[PDB]
Chain A
Amino acid sequence: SLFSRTPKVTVFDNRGLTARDIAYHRHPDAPEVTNERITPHQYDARGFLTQSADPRLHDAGRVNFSYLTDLAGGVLRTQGADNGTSVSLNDVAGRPFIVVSHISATTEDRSLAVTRTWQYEDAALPGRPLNVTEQISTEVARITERFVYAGNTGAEKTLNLAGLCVRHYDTAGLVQTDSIALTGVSLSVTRRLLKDADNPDTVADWQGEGASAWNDLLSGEEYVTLTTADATGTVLTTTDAKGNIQRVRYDVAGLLSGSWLTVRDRTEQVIVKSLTYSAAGQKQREDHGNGVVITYTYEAETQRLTGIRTERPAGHASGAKVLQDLRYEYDPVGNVLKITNDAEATRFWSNQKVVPENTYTYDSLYQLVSATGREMANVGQQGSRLPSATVPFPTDSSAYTSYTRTYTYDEASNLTQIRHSPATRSGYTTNITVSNRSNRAVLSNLTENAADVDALFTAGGQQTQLQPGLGLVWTARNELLKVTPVDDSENYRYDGGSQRILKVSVQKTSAQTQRALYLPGLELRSAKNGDTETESLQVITVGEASRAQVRMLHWESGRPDGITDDKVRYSYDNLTGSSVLELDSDGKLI
């Protein structure tokens, strides 16, 4: 009824190119009404795409993207409503040569434009990249990246280094590759940071006649990550920069069967004792170092994840308990209709039979239009801050009250309203104001007028205000550089691939400071109470960033009383990988 006669439709021109994508919108609130949504696309004589537009902007006679192409189809220019205008040209060898971006259309505001260029080896060499350059507006060009390659001396061959980049100087400093396997896996890499890397004023500019000069712009400290690998080129062990060793083992099918951690100057301890799999190779049963067992359950037909069951089993020193028993109910295409948890200790949902347990409803476009859940009665209205931690664990259904969220979406799939309706309290509404000519959008408190929305964004689609009186600065590469209030700041640094290597937070009244350095399987966290160290912390992280991770906290200095050193924190996730429970090395809830 809701989904009846709502197909996806592809409309061709007379050359078999897609002129229109048609969709059919229907809200369960109003099942009588069906809104047809047409996304037009234009092509030129050659058959290359020139224009696209969403239904909302087509309705208003405007366009989302315009494309200008060379005669082979290569896109030399994109004018986007959301991300501005940019010009691109590859050389005849197919390599990046120039990109000019941060340009706005009205002809073309070129004044804040970033020009990125590449320099390769000369024609008598293979043509590997030598440096990347970035020139912003009227400022002098800065050399943001450099590459140095190995020759093929016997020593280099012995390290499987021949012709590969051994020194990559990037936006954060240097990455040095000192050893490679027969299988091609990096066995020893070494990172050094820029001098004065905590200051967001310091940008990489690798000026100088050779490596002797470039190295003089780097800090002294070396963060060495070492790796061990099997005959298939698959990682077995990782030694982090503070000497902590992570180890894994593979079963006869090549799947992870166990893992261990050896903290520096300690003995090896079990992080994953065992791990079995279904026929499809998806986790079935997982046994942790803390004796906690995870049992995963799958629909036999669709292989969809039906159950996540976490428990301390029979004969466990801390006493048997089911900590989580998640169950999922899908609609036919695999949207989540219902989530139940019978292990929930408070027994909250069988007490409150007015609103149902995590029920979700969707429109014909599979957008979430309604949801129900529980919140803690004390949370109050959602903003940017995290609620206050309730300590200790609440012990009764009074602690949590139910809620029902309702979501509203425009013709271009912008989320314009989150409406919150609790059981027995005053509800609130968060309104998001969409631009009249783009999908740029901000909360109502920033503006309630569509025509002023794009002025809160840079040309490239980067938001300049986070909240009222909190300002945002972005790098030349559109990464978040700095959050500043208009007196607590935060700022960031990234490597060559835009992956955050550094975060520094500062509060000045005396200036209190915290720093996070992100390395392989390791976060070095520190703090100073005005150039005097209050805290020094290794967060050892075991696993992969898209799966239920295990953290170990080791304090070099400044451990607070009430935390035993080298305490492991096991994390336990839901369907979407959100961290829901933490347990300790006894399996007890943290």
Chain B
Amino acid sequence: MAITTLSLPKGGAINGMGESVGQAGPDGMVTFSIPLPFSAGRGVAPALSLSYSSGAGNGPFGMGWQCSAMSISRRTQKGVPQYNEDDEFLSPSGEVMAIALNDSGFEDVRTANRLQGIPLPFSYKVTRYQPRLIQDFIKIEYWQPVKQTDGTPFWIIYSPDGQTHILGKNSHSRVANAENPSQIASWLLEETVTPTGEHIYYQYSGENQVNCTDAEIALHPQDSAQRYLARIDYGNISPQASLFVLDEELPNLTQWLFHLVFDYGERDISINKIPTFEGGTTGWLARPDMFSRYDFGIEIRNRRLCHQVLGFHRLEALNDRDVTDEIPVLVNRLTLDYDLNNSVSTLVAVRQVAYETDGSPITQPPLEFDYQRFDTGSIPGWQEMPQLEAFNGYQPYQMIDLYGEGTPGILYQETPGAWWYKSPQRQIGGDSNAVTYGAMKALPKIPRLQATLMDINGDGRLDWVITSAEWTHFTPLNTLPTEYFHPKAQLADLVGAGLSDLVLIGPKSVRLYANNVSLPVIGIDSRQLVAFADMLGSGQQHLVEITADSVKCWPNMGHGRFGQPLTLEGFSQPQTSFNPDRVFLADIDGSGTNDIIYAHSECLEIYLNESGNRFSKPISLLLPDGVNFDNTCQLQAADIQGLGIASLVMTVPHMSPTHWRCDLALNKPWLLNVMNNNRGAETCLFYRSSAQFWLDEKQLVEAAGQQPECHLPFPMHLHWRSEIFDEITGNRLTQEQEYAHGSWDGQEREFRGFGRLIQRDTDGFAQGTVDIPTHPSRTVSWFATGIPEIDTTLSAEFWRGDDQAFSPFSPRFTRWENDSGSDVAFIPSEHDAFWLNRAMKGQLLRSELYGDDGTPEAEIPYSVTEMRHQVRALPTTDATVPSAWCSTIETRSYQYQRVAADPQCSQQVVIKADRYGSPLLSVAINYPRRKKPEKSPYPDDLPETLFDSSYDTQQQQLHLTKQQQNYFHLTNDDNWLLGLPKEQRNDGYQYDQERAPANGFTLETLIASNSLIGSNQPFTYLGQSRVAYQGGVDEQPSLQALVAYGETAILDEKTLQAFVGVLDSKTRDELLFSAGYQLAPRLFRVESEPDVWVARQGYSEFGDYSQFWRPLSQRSTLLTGKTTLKWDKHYCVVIETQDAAQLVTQARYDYRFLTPYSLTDANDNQHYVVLNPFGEVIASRFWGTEAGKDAGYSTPQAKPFVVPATIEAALALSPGIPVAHCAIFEPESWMQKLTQHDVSERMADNGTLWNALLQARFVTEDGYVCALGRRRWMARHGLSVLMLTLLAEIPRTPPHSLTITTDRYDSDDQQQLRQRILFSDGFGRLLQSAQRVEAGESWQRSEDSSLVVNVSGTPALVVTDNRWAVSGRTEYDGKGQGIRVYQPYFLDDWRYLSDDSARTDLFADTHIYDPLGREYQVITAKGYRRERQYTPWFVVNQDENDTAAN
């Protein structure tokens, strides 16, 4: 237990937001998370993250990003919902739900009129739902009014931590049909309440017409549905156990101590204009890339971007002052900067701003982002396509992905009736993404005639649509609306009898023929084109009609319904020359929206579709030299690279060669590819398509004489490479991922993950005079896809080099069956298998770790870890689809250290788990060492004796350590709290090596009647642990889980043997009683087991609910006295402690951070700090009484201290300062300083360029040049050589701080100012430390930050008044380990000596780390070596004398 001690925050090192990139996973996506930097308040707080995913689409934080609480939504992935009893619901995890069963085996429904003891106005039908995969065992309820007119339905989620969450109670937290509020797409989190009576409330704003054009309003009247997160209130004044939304009225805004406000452009974006609590009156801004989504069968319109997040605290309320007319005060401010764009808006910067009491801003360096972009300017021109040279230039071909490999091959008819397919393949010895085409395979024979379905590609499903012009056209079924062959509503009107022909005019766009809304008429040979295509970027095949001067699009709403026509201006051609045949529809820029490509004789005109709203001014693209497009030519748009973007392929007969390609982009745009924290750290990311990866995999599978089987039919953009640059050291880390065994599942239209991930990490260093050999590490990992035809092929690929290793684990499947209950294994049916195998998707099966260092042992792994999974099937109202709880029941780790024959091996098994997933019985096994071989497997340079002497009998003893435990739960009535600590016991079993099962332990061998951990078998009792509770029945928990004490076993009969010659029973026992020990029942008892001596720890007395159940007193044991705790007004922080000797500590709090700023100790002496707007200590002092009289520093009231603005000023202070310490922080020093006066003077333009560069976020308002803002500006507008010169002369330096420490009180004229300077890097690591010293001999720093050196080569010495001792200087590698650590040195400057000069001139020890991050070698500055060798059973250390003899 933690006894509360009051103390002031200690000083200090520069570090950012806790921003972090995710580990590379089996989904292959780049992820990124920023914790929102705002107060936790009392402890119960929103704790949200602004997070990115490369898989994610657009939203209120730009492409890829989100920041939202939990929700429940109608399922849209398996058909559009119709707002009837046939709709399905999704859990917060995105997982499909079904109605659950109760004890009796029926639909778990009930009626209620009381919720949390609170009378409801009318009665509700309350249905429990269960998701298909169980994560946490959350309880989920649907609340439906019995009389449908009484109100709207809502959801409740009971989290097993004891908290209760309510979604969509009121209409502001519901995404609903603009036309009809009953039809609810989504219920959003609105209120949480905890067992302590603490709340969080979430307020949303509905979408509306404010600051939109009349064009926009006209086109999109159904605009009210969407919700945006607007305010989050927490730190409720009134402690209440029931939800606030169940009272007659919600609390006033003033009953919440903390607010989090999301601004959507209404407030001034400037760092100089302090944001106020209320929004001002100009209204939220309209984004340019407005977009709609139709998933739910209703338009949801999106117009808003979040520009600021703001933390507000009620300072008067917190300080128990007069609340009348209190405005909450701003504590922290997060600005969000966007690159605003008509197609796709992207989040490019987030920055922290706060304010000094004089109003002036203080800033952290901005965290910047940039993305892959489509460049209008540098569109790659045409290029001949030798892959189609076998065709003559008249022969028609379709570029099309016939087999579902994610890359198109060549489909062609040689002679009539004879169709062949050339499948895409890796071109050998080309570019690494170069695509060639393989051997022809004959398609199946096609019927006499009919538009009709066919299984053309041999996958079992009727998913190709064949039609005839007599030519023949192949069209994938997914390019048409879902019920094309059984249409309804408008779709029926359009096709009527059925269309005469379907022709692809792009990868997923198809032209149509024949012979409530006003739909188009499909004319016979008109000057007009009709088609199915996604012209809106919502991901449905919408209806589009193109005439010579109009583009009209009708949104597919599902089930054949089509909504009102939308126009898209900016496309036209002359009414005499417009030809439908020359129109193509394909997403050229990867924005999600199909673009228009129109072809003339000598050029192409590309009209980019702007977020489905209009078309851009057309890009003109010239055809190759001397080409004249006409009817004899062939042109199509097709994603030939496998990038999810169209290139163009063109055949021209009157031309040599006949076949051409134009790739318009080589990257998929709008994916995050650069982060820069502006502190010396940049991460660059590189993507490579799953499709491209498939062609690599297919070549390998073909080279090995095997038949390739692809299971992922479309291109996904996978995280291929990360390069993490240390801009200060010049070092880097490359992380490369490779993917295999990709699995998509047709039945559920769901991605399952990749079956194998190979990760390679490689350090890159800048050059030094003592070079570090970089040895890359390789991790090979296999994950379950949950498709057995994939999953059964994986163990084949495991490392086979240890013939004695145990056989691969196998997934266990269980059913819960009750008794006085338990898991029981079964073999499921092929029907239930599908769902229970799916439950293991993404689970780690095995991981192998290598070092690719070219040595003989390189092919042998350091370690191998493998896991066994158990899926427990759980019944629901759905008989066809069981629910499932996946767990990891065995883990086996082999430690080889790259020697195959003599590994160490351990295994941990969860034998029994309770109904709520908690482990009841488990065991940790340590296997014996293998039988000693004849010759030594270890290299012959060790002592000859060592191999034999490495053996010990303790290595041959099998150990199994058994652990039992149980838990408290509170599931009675309408509360839900699981897994509370209760009891634990541990038992040691030890056997000889003969008794280890020959093929290893499994769960089965451990539960068997003859088990080595059976209750028959002899054991050693290792101890036990018990938690006792108070405030409920006996020592059992209430919902508040208030601990009474913790109890652990200290002595059993075996351990009492200690006292045998020294004390006797009577004297021994009465000593143990007076020592505070006591007898308690031995837990999980066996027959005749005596009580054990236990020690009890951690006693607290708690307050009542009005005091938020906070602790009011504490003691460690009953032998010592208690310490009292007094809280502030609203029970946020403790302001006084009083111990058992009446000694009193007190604290006053800075309520913008809820940390103390002043502290009165037991002798009434005073301690004080000044916190800056980011909560850092910039000054501190103390005073009080000593030796009869007042003592210490002058008070802050007597002598206020102003902290100097710069380091220069601070280094120039005179003695006599009334502070113990003061601190200047320079977190933004890696950013170059550039002022308006610098700029305006260097051009003579009166700030024309300065205000352009500020707008474009090249530079911040406070004069710091942003790394990625520069690069973005340089790419678009360039930069004059007058500016480049200025910029090249403005230096920069790593993040740093100066701390001044006084050695005497300010009354004493002997006071000195001690001066200490710290340098950090972009990863927050301490780089070096400089202490000011007396004048004397030092080395010399030049203006360019290099060392001055003599002609002789040793550093040039001078005597100086400005001498500093540099200590702890460390060069880090990628993993953050000290690769070089330098000796201390004197220097005539506090500034940073370049890592360039350091490596050449200063003495350093070099530390070399292995792939597990263990130091195995050191090269001392003098030249000597310490080496160390790791083996499973021994480690060998060699010092400088040992190695020197080599």
Residues of A within 8 A of B (CB): 1-17, 19-20, 22, 24, 34, 36, 38, 40, 42-46, 68-72, 74, 76-77, 85, 87, 89-93, 97-98, 100, 103, 107-108, 110, 113, 120-121, 123-127, 149, 151-152, 156-163, 179-182, 187, 230-232, 234, 250-254, 257, 276-281, 299-303, 331-333
Contact = CB atoms under 8 A, between A and B. Distances in A.
B1243 interface: no
A179 B1403 CA distance: 48
A123 B1121 contact: yes
A42 B1305 contact: no
Given A19-B954, A87-B1059, 14 more contacts: A8-B1436, A12-B1434, A34-B943, A72-B1048, A89-B1071, A91-B1119, A123-B1120, A124-B1121, A125-B1140, A158-B1187, A159-B1188, A250-B1312, A301-B1403, A332-B1422
B1434 A9 contact: yes
A406 B946 CA distance: 30
A157 B1185 contact: yes
A302 B1304 CA distance: 35
B1435 A5 contact: no
B959 A91 contact: no
B1386 interface: yes
A93 B1055 contact: no
Contact of A11 (B1023, B1141, B1434): B1434
B1077 interface: yes
B1347 to A, nearest CB: 14
A98 B1074 CA distance: 11
B1185 A158 contact: yes
Contacts of A331: 1441
B1141 A4 contact: no
Nearest to B960: A45
Contacts of A5: 941-943, 1442, 1445
A332 B943 contact: no
A540 to B, nearest CB: 24
B954 A43 contact: yes
Interface stretch (B101-109, B231-239, B1328-1336): B1328-1336
B1444 interface: yes
B1421 to A, nearest CB: 4
Contact of B1186 (A97, A108, A121, A160): A160
Contact of B952 (A19, A124, A158, A182): A19
Interface in B929-984: 929, 941-943, 945-946, 949-950, 952, 954-957, 959, 961
B1049 interface: yes
B2 interface: no
A333 B1220 contact: no
A187 B1185 CA distance: 13
B1312 A280 contact: no
B1441 A332 contact: yes
A182 B1191 contact: yes
Given A89-B1071, A93-B1117, A182 B1303 contact: no
B1022 A46 contact: yes
Given A123-B1118, A331-B1441, A230 B1192 contact: no
A126 B1062 contact: no
Interface string B1367-1388: 1000000000000000111100
B1437 A126 contact: no
A228 B776 CA distance: 59
A10 B1435 contact: yes
B517 interface: no
Interface stretch (B477-485, B610-618, B1161-1169): B1161-1169
Given A4-B1446, A5-B943, A12-B1434, A103 B1119 contact: no
Contact of B1140 (A11, A124, A279, A303): A124
B1420 interface: yes
B437 to A, nearest CB: 56
B1119 A162 contact: no
Contact of A182 (B1119, B1192, B1444): B1192
A162 B1304 contact: no
Interface of B: 904, 926-929, 941-943, 945-946, 949-950, 952, 954-957, 959, 961, 988-990, 1020, 1022-1023, 1048-1052, 1055, 1057-1063, 1071-1072, 1075-1077, 1095-1097, 1116-1121, 1139-1144, 1162-1165, 1182-1188, 1191-1193, 1220, 1301-1305, 1311-1315, 1331-1334, 1336, 1365-1367, 1383-1386, 1403, 1420-1422, 1424, 1432-1442, 1444-1446
Contacts of B943: 5-7, 24, 34, 36
Nearest to B1071: A98
B929 A152 contact: no
B1187 A253 contact: no
A121 B961 CA distance: 41
A279 B1366 contact: yes
A126 B954 contact: no
Given A182-B1184, A252-B1314, A6 B1075 contact: no
A45 B1020 contact: yes
A231 B1334 CA distance: 20
A333 B1365 contact: no
A301 B954 contact: no
Contact of B1336 (A45, A250, A276): A276
Name the prevailing secondary structure of the A interface residues.
loop
23 contacts: A6-B943, A7-B942, A8-B1436, A9-B946, A11-B949, A12-B1434, A14-B904, A14-B955, A76-B1055, A76-B1058, A85-B1061, A93-B1116, A98-B1071, A110-B1061, A160-B1165, A160-B1185, A182-B1184, A232-B1301, A232-B1303, A280-B1383, A299-B1422, A301-B1403, A301-B1422
A42 B1334 CA distance: 55
A22 B946 contact: yes
A126 B1140 contact: yes
Nearest to B1142: A152
A5 B1183 CA distance: 62
Contact of B1121 (A46, A127, A257): A127
Contacts of A257: 1334
A91 B1440 CA distance: 47
A76 B1062 CA distance: 12
Contact of A252 (B955, B1140, B1334): B1334
Given A4-B1442, A72-B1048, A120 B1121 contact: no
Contacts of B1440: 332-333
Contact of A108 (B1061, B1336, B1439): B1061
B1060 to A, nearest CB: 8
A14 B1220 CA distance: 54
A125 B1182 CA distance: 29
A93 B926 CA distance: 34
Contacts of A45: 959, 961, 988-990, 1020, 1022
A92 B1096 contact: yes
Contact of B1437 (A8, A93, A108): A8
Contact of B1141 (A85, A149, A251, A303): A149
Contact of A163 (B1117, B1162, B1303, B1311): B1162
A505 B1130 CA distance: 70
Given A14-B928, A92-B1117, A152 B1143 contact: yes
B1385 to A, nearest CB: 5
B1121 A91 contact: no
A384 to B, nearest CB: 36
A330 to B, nearest CB: 10
Contacts of A87: 1058-1059, 1062-1063
Contacts of A36: 943, 945-946, 949
Given A2-B1445, A279-B1386, A332 B1436 contact: no
Nearest to B941: A5
Given A13-B954, A43-B954, A92 B1095 contact: yes
A71 B1052 contact: yes
A158 B1434 contact: no
Contacts of B1432: 12
A301 B1383 contact: yes
